[model samples]
Target chain A: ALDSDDEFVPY
Target chain B: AHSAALEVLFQGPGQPGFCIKTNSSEGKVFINICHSPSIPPPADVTEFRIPMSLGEPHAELDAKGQGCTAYDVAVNSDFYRRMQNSDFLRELVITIAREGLEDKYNLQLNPEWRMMKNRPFMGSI
Candidate 1:
């Protein structure tokens, strides 16, 4: 699972 | 039916996703995506066709197993030029979605393609 910091970012 | 030389499949926030196809044989490229939630047919469709004269599109993506990224490309930019090159296009597909193509005919394009934002803007194809 992705951590908060590892969550996907938007462009 | 003849197969397309290049096909890019992507999903937006709507119904069935969109597809960008190229017929190198015809020297043409066009998109089959839509902005509406419903599938608009040939006649009943209502979305407006925004002219490229305003500005080219800015595409962003976030694949299932990849980070998000954006691509700012004009209607007929070298971005399409690179895609028009079947060989490099194949390599690009392989570089991004090694197995997705075989499994689902989908590709997770490279984020580096963002660099193409600066490529020379070619005339619309």
Candidate 2:
């Protein structure tokens, strides 16, 4: 979930 | 199935929660786990989130706990509210995630193949 959060933040 | 995908477009822009949608596509080679939910079809699993402003959904073909391929689709009334760019952006993000994200990879080349067309200004973008 952390990775999804990170990716979505920039995306 | 014609030219000019339109406003309230066919298979593109439906009334938020009022379209019968389905997705059938090949999943990428590297994806391992796929999760999705749709407003029209509902979730196949409990952990998946239901569509809010935008309908979200996905599917994964797995073998021995390993995913081989996936396909996803989404629809929403917020697609009609282009006036709210922020919500539209959020909806786009969530929709993209629902349609592309996996444990192993993300969709690098996503395409929306228009199955039908209506008259609209920015139909092919």
Candidate 3:
């Protein structure tokens, strides 16, 4: 359903 | 590609938390993790926060608590279909690994998709 965001932060 | 076909909710004890919105037509699933106020959790389970880049920190500390975190990701229909049987962890490992790939020259990569194959077969009945 959702696409990866412009940025990422660790889980 | 369009609106959600199905939406599923997940909650922590005494409060609500996250949702899984599946767009069947688009073959996509959005994991919407909400911001819930924190409370002291149990000793056996640990409380954690997920960043908004993946999204915000939200969850419940309860005996019945399960996983609720955020990550914005899009994969194909076939990949998504197989993911359910793979217990989710498989795709997660590959997703993080491919983050490194984004940073590859047509590089072919192999992922061990199916793992932890121990499951109840239909013979015990």
Estimated TM-score per prediction?
Answer: 0.17, 0.21, 0.20
TM-score of chain B of each: 0.17, 0.22, 0.21
The window of 10 residues in a row where model 3 chain B has the poorest summed lDDT is B116-125
Interface RMSD of each: 12.7, 14.7, 16.0
For model 2, chain A alone compared with the true chain A gives a TM-score of 0.29
Q: List model 2 lDDT by residue over B31-115, tens digit each.
A: 1111122223223565433332221223333223434432223334333333235654534434443343322244343333221
lDDT (Cα, tens digit) per residue for candidate 3, span B36-85:
23322112435311111132223321112333222232222333334445
Q: Kindly report which residue stretches of model 3 are placed more than 4 angstroms away from their true locations once superposed.
A: A1-11, B1-71, B88-125
Ranking of candidates on lDDT, top first:
2, 3, 1
Instruction: Return the candidate ranking by TM-score, descending.
Output: 2, 3, 1
Q: Tell me, what's the RMSD of every candidate?
A: 16.3, 16.4, 18.9
User: Measured against the native two-chain assembly using Cα atoms, what DockQ does each of the candidate structures obtain, in the order listed?
Assistant: 0.10, 0.02, 0.03
* Per-residue lDDT of B95 in model 1: 29
